[PDB]
Assembly symmetry: D2
Homo-oligomer: 496 residues x 4
């Protein structure tokens, strides 16, 4: 445990919590993050040129062996991570044949392809983390089917639910965001190589080959769109922003739960900090830095769209990027909230107490009057509203409101009495009966939530299966490319 | 023609152009736009309550007849277009039974459903307009397979293409945006009714029935998500923003084409204005107001996401909306650019002249040296760069560069001569040969572009078919609801 | 009271509250808002032309009388509120001499001047409302110098303060925002007339005269800057956004205070609503619609800056505007929060109770150990942190922590005892003594806050004086212009 | 010259150009940028505690000597750059007395003060760079009083001006932005130390002393505002964004000037790049990366304001920061555009040619008809518009339009002839006479622009004087603090 773990900040920070403090100093520049993908593009482009007869196997093998050498130099020399200095280092290593690797190619389609491969890997990384986020949310829900508590609207107690019911709302939010990310992946995972500067080339390239060797699923067909297309960058920034906004809302929800006044939940010690001056603080540092990441995600979205609004439909060096440190912040926040949800400690007795005492059961009292004594809904509302006004005025908790108070309210509001028993009123005000009566689809009754959990468990299986399939497709292509490179270098070494 | 049609502003404004001036004063408030959908929800909810036995057929028919009456009052009384004043007008019309239409319902899920139905209709309206935009772009492309012109990168002449090739880049951009809109529609077209305040209800509703009567394809299952879910609003705002950013880039592209210095295109008179003080102006008012709409679309996107980042995962009156005047601006801009593209007049001779004279053919000269005399690509680049530096210095247009100038550049740069003929150089510098040599996938050669046009023509057929299917589904549901309402009112009038 | 005033929504909405519901349907378009200022510019320009000898007094009087006539037509004919249709209506009224009012002028500098005059009036309107906001905040503070309560950091109870101390934080925030608005006014209140299209004119205008007649304090000198300058629009949008963000933070603060769990404040009935289904709701509709206005203000700021980033330094029809409905939303939110602050009802007993019982007094216990028994600050912190951990574990409220609990914590943490009396501990934990001990500058002790109130009362006097001076300058100029117009029309009628 | 300097990319990149490529990899984290200011705060706080008698001179000297030691450790150990790990390293060095440096202090007011000192230094750095930007713009203008060229509106040639006239528009823009930065500095340069956690302290601090030792000009008085105030961060982000938007507009303007079609300006070789595939490219890489920086500046502004809209008026770890790499991007872009403006090469002959031939002189022809033959302004406009329509139709350049063409247009449009000479028409169409006739305030006539240059030269002197004064105030305080530290350490070493 480091020096911030003093007083009530007991134990060490959870590693998910620690990520929130580390990502910024640890993030790569976009140039350094994309550089390893430029190397892969060089090999796939050279292999494709070799299959097309633009390069001989001897030329190809000289280039490919040199790529490995310059790749090793650039591991410690950042100046070799942009195209032309890299090419010049390659030319100093293997000679003038290094220049031939740029046949039919530009920096424009090379940079668009490399950025796509970077965002592609970061997209699967994101999808993996959001799946783990949803897993923690669903698995937590399954343990709280009977954890009765109030739900809020406008930050006011509304009606009784369960913690499991609340968490499945988050699960449905995450399922739709996973669809957004998967829909985006289909547009990110297209290869623009072969567009060259913006208009293709007279060299007889095989664009499908280059695309396949790099794991892309299809082509960015039109060559202008290949170098000028940037909407997938804006879309990636947007889904990041809207997903994180839902994460901010849950962090904010848990933060209010764990205020000194609510006290219906408490953060795990490993996800809280304290003050150096106020020893009583158990601070939601994990929650607030997670929200901060969500707020910061607005930045790339606006910058990218602003740059697109400011140019023509051309290749342009003025377009704003989605940078590694932005995605790194998202992953840190997602992991932190995963651990926050997993380790959250609800005060079940305080939750039930608020539900039973603070008048969220009044809707069921109103519905009972309408459904049992058959008064108009507005008139039942006016009676129960008077009940609450009086109960508050006299200090009577909701689970102490009885037949007398209801009748005086009726008489006070309608002149007439009311035709109900004390048992009917008691069952209307029982908060657990409130939950059980709400047994429709998507409602908090345990059997309803359990059905939602069964559906989410099945959908999570599809989520992991999609991620596994997309990951293996990239791994298989990366292996085919590596095999092709060895075949060319070894064959030239031994038989040519 | 109005009073702005003076001097070079001849004829009347195209009606698509005129839309850009009218939408703001003509736009409805969100309340007035959503109100007709609240009326439909009332009927569908009441019908569902009747099928469930919560309302008798007599109660149902009294309510339904009263809804038509209050609907007629609210046509001229805006104060009756929010829920509770509407309900009070209904209660003054048919009596206290009006209160029963709110059984098992809240304003929270009513407003979420109504806003969805509004955005749903506006989404099909948007998809229709974007289809018409893509239609004008593809059909224009088919008439310019041989309209040779330069493409630009970084606002500098790059290589020769055709106008048809350029327009098919826009078509590919629009196809992906149509996917974004259709993906969004699947999330917008879910029914949150039955969530009531946030936690469902003990009343035995049939949520699938209410959803079907209103044309929704599925449910927003979880009841918290039903009233708290707002990501589809942010997503709708985003796709609007990213689509319009592509529209801004094309408007900007056409604006540079039609500058007094480029002069490669001229706006149709019906899409241009003029100055009251400078009589020589033919101003791109249509283009700049279209870009203005794209810039303004950033606003709702940021406001909506900011409001989501600022709350808990609850129903909240603090969430920012996507308003009718924002969508109205998008439609006006899309229609205007549809007409701009349809009626655009390119100066084909000036386009060819720039391609032939301003050195965009230098890549093919460089590729010819590498591919024919077999020099290293960097060395060919240095020779052709010297050719251009000299040609500019001496005032020699690209289509006048001959064998001499190329050899002196070679000698000046390599000491050695060069092993090419004047015919090889002439064919390298022929701009139409530049286009023909680029015959790969997505490249400007007429046969390549024609293939892209064939594909887009087929995809446009799928686009219109999707829109027709989604539209008819809503029309059929609206008719079923209307039939159900008449059955209840007429049966009660005659047989009960 | 309208139909939303049911149940606990007693009485009628405060008119400041009602503004939040009315501004959107009542807002003018920018064109209709700026039109009356275009009329004033016409008169000031014509008068200036008359002084310069460009117009005769007879020509001037014919034009001026015609301006009044067309002004009356345009009161009901919106088509006459853009320049050229207005001019054509003027020409149909008085003849071809109407064309002479545009000598040396363009629509470009006319629109820039008119928008400035609109924003100028709306800026004084804003400054007036923010002054009233600060007045309500300071005057409320003066009545709560002894209203002890906790302040929060990270939504956790921190240390004891007073409500008056909290409100003076808001006052200091508002004082700096008033400086932002006044600094902006100096840049808004410059006249760009005389720039004509963008490059001035050969006509011998007197720009100082036109500026003075319209109440401007100086010129936008350079003629390009006159028509192309737009930063004051972006700046106006920004100050709106940052001011409202502070208003959102106070609304959010009051919303947490008035949660069912805090219960340290209650909104006045005239600033709260209720639910149609949940009769127990007293909802912070005023607070959440005020925050919504703050979130929406992000929109114009981004749209305006995006449009500026997208063009050249020219006049351009693509620039995004600050529209009346945006400023209207700000004024409604400012008025609402003015009334919210004025009528807010704090529960003083609950406030004191939290301060005394929920451990915000622990800092003073820690400071007492360091200052009295002379232990290292970290060691005192570790002892008091143990006190809190134990007190929470045993259910002991802070104002029940005594000598025993402190000594056992010392022994548990240092092995040694502690050299303090029960009276020292009791005074360290007295929350009102916590407040009194913090008597430095800007601290919550009543004498400190009272000094801050004395300073703010004096500054508010300067605020109102600045507003009065700027307002009277505009009123005097508007009268001089009106007198000049009558002099020209009457003199021509009677003596020429 | 590096490996990107090939072909037409001759010589080495200007160092201002090179900054655009280096700042991102070279930028510090906010933590590492603020750390040296935390060290200064420690010393100033300890000195203040010593003057107040809270620390003895021996305690003070032990702490101060230890601060230098830990400062040296943290130069290579980034883990020691947050408060509590730093304090723990101090405690391991000098013992438990290290804990006393936090008396009456929190991390909350320490971080607010340190961030202010960072932004304060970066603000003077920004003001210095913007002054150098304005210097290059004014000094360039002084050399082009007679460089006749057209000005554009809506990207169309408008009227003749001079390059000097255009640049003075930029100067007036920069003067107002310098006012924004100086107004901000007054709010940034306030000391929040003494606020402690949020509510001050019972320790008898002297806040004015701490403020003075750190160079602040005043206090953030209220203690809540001291830790919760964040508007100066948002304001700093905004002025950055609006200033850069003006820089983007000039970069965009110069980019269009230097298109292959305009050809009225050419970037200096040291500020241009080229393509690896297209040898004819001279690319505006400096301009587009400068615009990219302007677009990216939208990000921090939105993120900061979003975070403020999302919290209460408290200290909060969720607030978004203005980070060093954002300010670094601004400085790189400002320096680059400074060098771009200084070294820009206008083609004066092409500029004059466009002015003389492409009809920007038509306003003066129209004004001449009104002022000389006394026709109505609309009728003159219709005649000159017909002149242009015919001149374009027949290929007649503006400086070849003579008496015949004007008369036929008159006859074609009014039936009547026109009463002007060929000499009157020739002088109306002389572009240099157009400039000379516009001799009012802020107009392009050389004598007018020269007056504007005289005013700017005087204002630039005030700008540098303000910067010098604010800089020396900080330098003097930093020296007083250093002297105080030596006095305490040396006195304790030798006499105590």
């Amino acid at each position: 445990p480091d020096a911030t773990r003093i007083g009530r900040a007991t134990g060490a920070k959870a590693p998910e919590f620690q990520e929130l403090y580390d990502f910024d100093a640890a993030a790569l520049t976009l140039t350094s993050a994309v550089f390893p993908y430029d190397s892969q593009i060089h090999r796939a482009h050279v292999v494709m040129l070799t299959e097309q007869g633009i390069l001989t196997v001897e030329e190809s093998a000289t280039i490919l062996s040199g790529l490995a050498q310059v790749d090793e130099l650039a591991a410690t020399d950042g100046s070799l991570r942009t195209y032309l200095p890299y090419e010049a280092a390659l030319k100093r290593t293997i000679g003038s044949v290094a220049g031939k690797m740029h046949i039919g190619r530009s920096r424009n389609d090379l940079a668009n392809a490399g950025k796509r491969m970077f965002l592609r890997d970061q997209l699967l990384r994101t999808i993996e983390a959001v799946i783990g986020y949803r897993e923690a949310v669903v698995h937590k829900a399954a343990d709280h089917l009977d954890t009765v508590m109030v739900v809020y609207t406008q930050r006011k107690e509304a009606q009784p639910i369960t913690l499991g019911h609340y968490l499945m709302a988050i699960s449905e939010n995450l399922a739709k965001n996973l669809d957004r990310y998967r829909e985006l992946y289909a547009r990110i995972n297209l290869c623009p190589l072969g567009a060259a500067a913006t208009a293709g080339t007279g060299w007889p390239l095989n664009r499908d080959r280059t695309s396949a060797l790099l794991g892309f699923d299809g082509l960015v067909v039109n060559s202008i769109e290949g170098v000028a297309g940037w909407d997938h960058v804006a879309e990636h920034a947007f889904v990041n922003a809207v997903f994180l906004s839902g994460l901010s809302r849950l962090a904010s929800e848990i933060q209010l739960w764990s205020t000194d006044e609510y006290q219906v939940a408490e953060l795990d010690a490993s996800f809280a900090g304290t003050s150096s001056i106020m020893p009583q603080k158990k601070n939601p540092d994990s929650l607030e830095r997670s929200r901060k990441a969500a707020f910061a995600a607005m930045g790339p979205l606006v910058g990218i769209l602003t740059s697109l609004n400011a140019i023509e439909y051309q290749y342009s060096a003025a377009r704003v990027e989605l940078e590694p440190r932005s995605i790194d912040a998202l992953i840190a926040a997602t992991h932190a909230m995963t651990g926050v949800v997993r380790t959250l400690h609800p005060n079940k007795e305080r939750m039930r107490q608020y539900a039973a005492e603070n008048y969220s059961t009044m809707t069921d009292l109103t519905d009972m009057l309408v459904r049992r004594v058959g008064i108009d809904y507005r008139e039942a509302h006016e009676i129960v509203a008077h009940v609450v006004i009086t109960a508050i005025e006299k200090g009577i908790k909701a689970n102490k409101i009885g037949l007398d108070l209801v009748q005086e309210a009726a008489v006070a509001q309608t002149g007439a009495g009311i035709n109900v028993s004390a048992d009917d009123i008691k069952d209307a005000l029982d908060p657990w009966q409130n939950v059980l009566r709400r047994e429709g689809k998507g409602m908090p009754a345990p059997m309803s939530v359990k059905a939602s959990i069964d559906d989410a468990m099945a959908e999570l299986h599809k989520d992991r299966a999609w991620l596994a399939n997309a990951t293996q497709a990239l791994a298989n292509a990366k292996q085919t490319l590596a095999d092709s490179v060895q075949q060319i270098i070894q064959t030239d070494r031994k038989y040519l």
